C-alpha cells in the first residue's frame, strides 16, 4: 500500500515480526555518544539487542553513525548478520554550496550493509557522496530516499527511529516522536490487530 | 537542488559542485622546526621494522592496495601482520589510508591491534569535473572517495580533502594530508611508511620499496631530537 505509514512506539518493545520483510532497512539511531544529549538515547546493548534480523531476508541496511557509533554501528551491523559493503558520506553545505574533537567535522557517515542474496537492484546508479544543505540539526537529507528508490524501486522499506519529517511513500516509519498509528497495507493491519487487540 | 539526481542524469558527482584569520605563521614555525628529510629504501615485508628508531610521534601508512590498480599489492593480511606497535611512541598518532573497500573495516582492526583509538575519519573526495566506471562486485554505489583513518594512543582543519580524481594508474595521495598532519603539532618524529621518491618531504622519514636512494642513519636521525629538542611540538621556535 504505496503511501506513507507509521507507528509511534518504543522500538525496544515493539514486536517487529508483524511487519513482514523489507528490501531496504534504514535507521538514524539516537546513539549514546555520551555528551549528555538533549534527547533520549538507547544504550549500547539496547541497540545490540534490536530485532533487525527478522526484518529482512535479502536486502540492504542503511545505518547512520558518528563518533564512536562508527565502530559500534559496525558491531551492530555485523551482529545483525550484515556485511558492510559501502559507506555514504554526506557533505554538509549551506545555501551557497560552501562547507559548514581534533578536526572540524564537515560530514556524516552512513554505513551500507547487505544481507543474503539481493536480486533486481540497480546497484551503481548513484555515487557514495551526497551534497545537500543542512536543515535542522539531527536531520538527514531527503536525497537518500531518491538514491534508495532508484536502488530498489517499488519495494517495501522500513525506517527505524524516524521522525515525522521522515515519512515517505513506500515506507513505514517507526519512532517515538510520531503521531500515533497510520497503517494501510491490509496484511500489516491484520497482523497488528492480531498482536495488539487494544493498542499497545 | 538534488545533486544525486543530477549525477544520475549528467555524470557529474555531487562533489563537483562544492565551492572552494591567517594561520600562515604556524607554517613558518613548522618549516623552521623541520628536520632535514630522511629516506630509506626497504622491502617492508622482508624488513625488520624494529631497526627503525627512535619511537615515532606520528606514523603515516600508505600501503599499496589492490584496488589502487584497477587498470606488489599488499593485502590487509600483510598490513595487519606489520609490527607497528614496536616502533610507535607511548603517546603517538597514526594516519592509515584504507581506500573505500574492506579497508574501512579491516583498517579499524589494525588500529585496535596496534593499540590506537580512531579519533578522526578523513575523506579524500574525488571530483570528476574533467571527465563526466567499474564497480566492485559487492559495491552498491559508485565509489568516489578514499578514507584516511586517524588514531591516537596514550593520553583549524576540516576532515575533508577535495581534489579531482587522479589519472588512471596514478596512485599518489593528496599532499593536503601532510598539511593536516603537520598543523596538529604532534611531534617531530614523523614516519611515512610506503612512501615513494615523490613523497619525500622535510620533517619526515620515508621508508618504502620503490625509493631509489637512501640517506638514513639511525644515529644521525636520533641526533635531531636529542636534548634540548626531545619534546618539540613541531610548531614552536627552535631553542639555541
Ligand atoms: C542523530 C539523531 C539525534 C536524535 C534523534 N532522535 C530520533 C528519534 N528517536 C526515536 O524514534 C526513538 C524511538 C524509541 O523507541 N526510543 C526508546 C528509548 C530512548 C530513545 C528512543 N528514541 C532520531 N534521532 C537521530
Q: Say if B240 falls within a structural domain.
A: no
Beta pairing class for B56-61 and B190-193: parallel
If DSSP codes are grouped into helix, strand and coil, which group holds residue B179? helix
Q: Say if B146 falls within a structural domain.
A: yes
CA–CA gap between residue A191 and residue A58 (Å, rounded): 22
Are B93 and B57 a contacting pair, CB within 8 Å?
yes
Asked whether the beta carbons of residue B2 and residue A150 sit closer than 8 angstroms, the reply is no
Is residue A65 classed exposed, middle or buried when 0-12, 13-18 and 19+ CB atoms within 10 A define those classes?
A: buried
Partner residue opposite A124 with nearest CB, options B19, B139, B160: B139
Cell digits of residue A136? 535542522
Instruction: Count the alpha carbons within 13 Å of B161 in the hemisphere toward its beta carbon.
Output: 20
φ/ψ (deg, to 5) at B81: -75, 0
If DSSP codes are grouped into helix, strand and coil, which group holds residue B158? strand
Are A25 and A158 a contacting pair, CB within 8 Å?
yes
From the list A70, A155, A72, A68, the residue with the least C-alpha distance to A120 is: A155
Q: Say if B102 falls within a structural domain.
A: yes
From the list B166, B125, B6, the residue with the least C-alpha distance to A92 is: B125
Q: Say if B71 falls within a structural domain.
A: yes
- The alpha carbons of chain A give a radius of gyration, in whole angstroms, of 17
Q: Whose CA is nearest to atom 24 of ligand 1?
A: A30
Partner residue opposite B14 with nearest CB, options A70, A87, A131: A131
Which secondary structure element, helix H or strand E, spans residue B110, and what is its range? Answer: helix B103-113
CA–CA gap between residue B150 and residue B168 (Å, rounded): 27
Asked whether the beta carbons of residue B3 and residue A70 sit closer than 8 angstroms, the reply is no
Please state the three-class secondary structure of chain A as a single string: CCCCEEEECCCCCCCHHHHCCCCEEEECCCECCCCCCCCCCECHHHHHHCCCCCCCCCEEEEEEECCCHHHHHHHHHHHCCCEEEEEEEEEEECCCCCECCCCECCEEEEEEEEECCCCCCCCCCCECEEEEECCCCCCCCCHHHHHHHHHCCCCCEEEECCCHHHCCCCEEEEECCCCCEECCCHHHHHHHHHHCECEC
What range does the domain containing B183 cover?
A: 3-223
CATH number at residue B68: 3.40.50
Q: How far is CA A73 from the centre of its chain?
A: 12
- Residues with Cβ within 8 Å of residue B21, at least 6 apart in sequence: none
Q: How was this structure determined?
A: X-ray
Kindly report the nearest CA distance between residue A52 and chain B, in angstroms: 20
| Resolution value in angstroms | 2.8
Q: How far is CA B130 from the centre of its chain?
A: 26
- Give rounded-to-5 percent helix, strand, coil for chain B: 25, 25, 50
> Between B103-113 and A69-79, two packed helices, what is the crossing angle to 10 degrees?
110
Q: How far is CA A144 from the centre of its chain?
A: 10
Q: Chain A contacts of B145, Cβ < 8 Å?
A: 89, 128-129
Residue A28 annotated as binding site? yes
Q: Say if B141 falls within a structural domain.
A: yes
- Residues with Cβ within 8 Å of residue A197, at least 6 apart in sequence: none
Q: Say if B237 falls within a structural domain.
A: no
Number of structural domains (chain B) is 1
Cell digits of residue B169? 594508474
Are B240 and B32 a contacting pair, CB within 8 Å?
no
Asked whether the beta carbons of residue A74 and residue B135 sit closer than 8 angstroms, the reply is no
Q: Say if B107 falls within a structural domain.
A: yes
Size (chain B), residues: 240
CA–CA gap between residue B141 and residue A129 (Å, rounded): 9
Amino acid at each position: 500500500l504505496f503511501p506513507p505509514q507509521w507507528i509511534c512506539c518504543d522500538i525496544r518493545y515493539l514486536d517487529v515480526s508483524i511487519l513482514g520483510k523489507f528490501a531496504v532497512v534504514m535507521a538514524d539511531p539516537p546513539w549514546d555518544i555520551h555528551m549528555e544529549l538533549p534527547y533520549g538515547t538507547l544504550t549500547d546493548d539496547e541497540m545490540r539487542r534490536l530485532n533487525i534480523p527478522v526484518l529482512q531476508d535479502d536486502g540492504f541496511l542503511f545505518l547512520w553513525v558518528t563518533g564512536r557509533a562508527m565502530e559500534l554501528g559496525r558491531e551492530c551491523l555485523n551482529l545483525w548478520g550484515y556485511e558492510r559493503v559501502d559507506e555514504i558520506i554526506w557533505v554538509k553545505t549551506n545555501q551557497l554550496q560552501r562547507i559548514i574533537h581534533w578536526l572540524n567535522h564537515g560530514k556524516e557517515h552512513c554505513l551500507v550493509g547487505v544481507k543474503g542474496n539481493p536480486q533486481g537492484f540497480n546497484q551503481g546508479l548513484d555515487c557514495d557522496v551526497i551534497v545537500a544543505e543542512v536543515r535542522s540539526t539531527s536531520h538527514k537529507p531527503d536525497e537518500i530516499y531518491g538514491m534508495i528508490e532508484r536502488l530498489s524501486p517499488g519495494t517495501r522499506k522500513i525506517e527505524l527511529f524516524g521522525r515525522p519529517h521522515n515519512v515517505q511513500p513506500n515506507w513505514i516509519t517507526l519512532g517515538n516522536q510520531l503521531d500515533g498509528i497510520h497503517l494501510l497495507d491490509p496484511d500489516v493491519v491484520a497482523r497488528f490487530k492480531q498482536r495488539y487487540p487494544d493498542g499497545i | 537542488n538534488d545533486y544525486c539526481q543530477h549525477f544520475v542524469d549528467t555524470g557529474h558527482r555531487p562533489q563537483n559542485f562544492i565551492r572552494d584569520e591567517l594561520i600562515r605563521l604556524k607554517d613558518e614555525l613548522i618549516a623552521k622546526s623541520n628536520t632535514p628529510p630522511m629516506y630509506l629504501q626497504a622491502d617492508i615485508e622482508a624488513f625488520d621494522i624494529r631497526e627503525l628508531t627512535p619511537k615515532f610521534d606520528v606514523i603515516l601508512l600508505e600501503p599499496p592496495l589492490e584496488e589502487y590498480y584497477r587498470e606488489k599489492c599488499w593485502t590487509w593480511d600483510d598490513i595487519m601482520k606489520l609490527e607497528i606497535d614496536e616502533i610507535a611512541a607511548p603517546r603517538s598518532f597514526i594516519f592509515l589510508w584504507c581506500g573505500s573497500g574492506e579497508g574501512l573495516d579491516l583498517g579499524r582492526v589494525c588500529l585496535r591491534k596496534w593499540g590506537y583509538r580512531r579519533c578522526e575519519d578523513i575523506c579524500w573526495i574525488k571530483t570528476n569535473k574533467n571527465n563526466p566506471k567499474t564497480l566492485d562486485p559487492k559495491a552498491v554505489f559508485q565509489r568516489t572517495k578514499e578514507h584516511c583513518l586517524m588514531g591516537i594512543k596514550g593520553t583549524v582543519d576540516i576532515d575533508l580533502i577535495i581534489t579531482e580524481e587522479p589519472e588512471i594508474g596514478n596512485i599518489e595521495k593528496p599532499v593536503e594530508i601532510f598539511h593536516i598532519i603537520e598543523h596538529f603539532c604532534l611531534g617531530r618524529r614523523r614516519l611515512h611508511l610506503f612512501g615513494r621518491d615523490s613523497t619525500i618531504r622535510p620533517g619526515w622519514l620515508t621508508v618504502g620499496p620503490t625509493l631509489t636512494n637512501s640517506n638514513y642513519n639511525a644515529e644521525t636521525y636520533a641526533s635531531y631530537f636529542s636534548a634540548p629538542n626531545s619534546y618539540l611540538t613541531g610548531c614552536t621556535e627552535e631553542i639555541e
